[PDB]
Homo-oligomer: A and B are copies of this chain.
């Protein structure tokens, strides 16, 4: 149960971790087996109050009021409410503190230097899918801000008995449709083919193009989900072009400005918010390496290398690698030219090392998942590659949850 050191082998800087001692949730590893590359490893009144007490305790600790009259009174209030209702409600201040800290605690996010600038929208009074649609339209408009993107989260009512869950069925608020072709191939985004069929089956008339914006599929109070169209003037998009290669715009690529993840679960003090879409801005490689060049995604490396007239017969010509750099140059140039906020992996990994040093200084550690933090291209020439990291699970947190079409009954 020591203090653990972490070393940077580029700078020989050595930080000391004490924060991991405060961890409670399990990571998935054992003393004999490490599972750090597994993507997803492995209530009632009775267990609810201790989880509530822990969270209330660290909140009043954070505002230098630990043991105050207010603190004592809030604990008493919460006990009486779990007693008589089998749950409790967060104060507005607590809700904001809780959401900011779930971002702060997200081991896999390289963008956490921004964690305390998070705009929190409280949607806990929502009762229908129409009201969900309204709240989501306001979120998108605020976060987009005509290209000057601002970080935000919208929080719908918490889970009760499990039969009345609020869910956003989309995995992101803005995504493109994908279509299984008669000839076996895929049109549009292949990552979204299943969701697209669910939408068509629900009455959505598909334009059947490469970049059709999906409709929102929204579930309130455990009812059947309902389809809504996002007003097109709210969806900001960027035509992808290349600063040197004139032919690149002829490829006809484009992407949306706003990354907004909508299928995770937010956990604060034992309460579960099953619908809580949150958004920031992109790191270029999320679009240019993964979205465009994954074999199971848009997979455009082949066409681009052809236009570059590269030798594609042998792998050792690194034609895949040259074409990759060029696509990511194009993505960054396009966003920047249209004044839409974006960060490159060099600048982002720099910021994160600075953030780590901040957190060790003021908090005594920073949980970090090397497997996800290091970018999907040019790893070792970014500073995070050579940085030792410790990974552990703090709460409040964001968690994975099951796709609602596996659980729902109509």
Contact = CB atoms under 8 A, between A and B. Distances in A.
Contacts of A388: 37-39
A381 B27 contact: no
A316 interface: yes
Contact of A379 (B7, B377, B381, B389): B377
Interface in A316-361: 316-318, 320-322, 324-325, 328-329, 332-333, 336, 344, 346-347
A31 interface: yes
A385 interface: yes
Contacts of A315: 344, 346-347
B34 A29 contact: yes
A4 B10 CA distance: 35
A390 B20 contact: no
Interface residues of A, number: 66
Contacts of A378: 320-321, 324, 377-378
A58 interface: no
Given A320-B378, A332-B316, A33 B390 contact: yes
Interface string A10-33: 100000000010011111111111
Given A9-B39, A29-B27, A379-B379, A318 B324 contact: no
A100 to B, nearest CB: 24
A378 B320 CA distance: 9
Contacts of A281: none
A316 B336 contact: yes
A376 B379 contact: yes
13 contacts: A10-B294, A23-B32, A27-B32, A27-B34, A29-B30, A29-B33, A30-B31, A34-B390, A35-B391, A315-B347, A316-B332, A318-B332, A318-B344
